[PDB]
């Protein structure tokens, strides 16, 4: 695929609350959130290349792409929101 899996690192959950609204505007409604090593990770899978770029532009304002792999987060991290992150958050903070 030229389809993209995107995992970003955020110092706090607040970063994911704030960007959540920007993601939904550009048609992103899912995402999985992990907690690991004192930080939050948002994972988004199977993005077309255009939205992948739109998405990386939102996330870059609040966090950094990560070196950690999806195996490490899943196996050793803590699953916070399983596949529905942007809409679970928007329920509350919108």
UniProtKB/Swiss-Prot annotation:
Assembly and partners? Homodimer.
List all membrane-crossing ranges.
none
Question: Record's domain comment?
Answer: The N-terminal domain has binding sites for ComK and probably for unfolded/aggregated proteins; the C-terminal domain interacts with ClpC.
Q: Which family does it belong to?
A: Belongs to the MecA family.
Write out the GO biological process terms.
Answer: establishment of competence for transformation; negative regulation of establishment of competence for transformation; negative regulation of sporulation resulting in formation of a cellular spore; sporulation resulting in formation of a cellular spore
Which UniProt keyword terms apply here?
Answer: Competence, Sporulation
Annotated GO molecular function terms are:
protein-macromolecule adaptor activity
Q: Classify the source by domain of life.
A: Bacteria
Q: What does this protein do?
A: Enables the recognition and targeting of unfolded and aggregated proteins to the ClpC protease or to other proteins involved in proteolysis. Also involved in Spx degradation by ClpC. Acts negatively in the development of competence by binding ComK and recruiting it to the ClpCP protease. When overexpressed, inhibits sporulation.
The protein here is known as Adapter protein MecA 2
